[PDB]
Design a protein around this nucleic acid. Structure first.
Length: 49
DNA sequence: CGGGCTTCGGCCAGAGGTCGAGGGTAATAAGAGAATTTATACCTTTATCGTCCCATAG
């Protein structure tokens, strides 16, 4: 599927830094992961007396 | 052969992390009427304490 979508078959490629703008020496893993948000908001946890 | 004497088995007590966070649920039916006490309400009587006139001591 990856090689069909013109993406690296290993699923990894070298990213560019966001501040210095220099490529990382080794390639990292990037992809779209289904992230959740749980009902543990800090808005309901912050108390102070 | 009864008797101290050790040991064992059944029975009960106590103790089991902390700190959050949220939610919910928490408990009813004799009337009559007689009687006794108590808080209330008005009123009078005595003392009390605020109040000022007056003689006097310096």
């Amino acid at each position: 599927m990856l090689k069909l979508a013109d993406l690296p078959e290993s699923g990894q490629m070298r990213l560019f830094d966001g501040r210095t703008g220099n490529q990382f020496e080794r390639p990292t893993t990037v992809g779209y992961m289904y992230m959740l948000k749980l009902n543990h908001l800090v808005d309901d946890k912050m108390h102070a007396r």
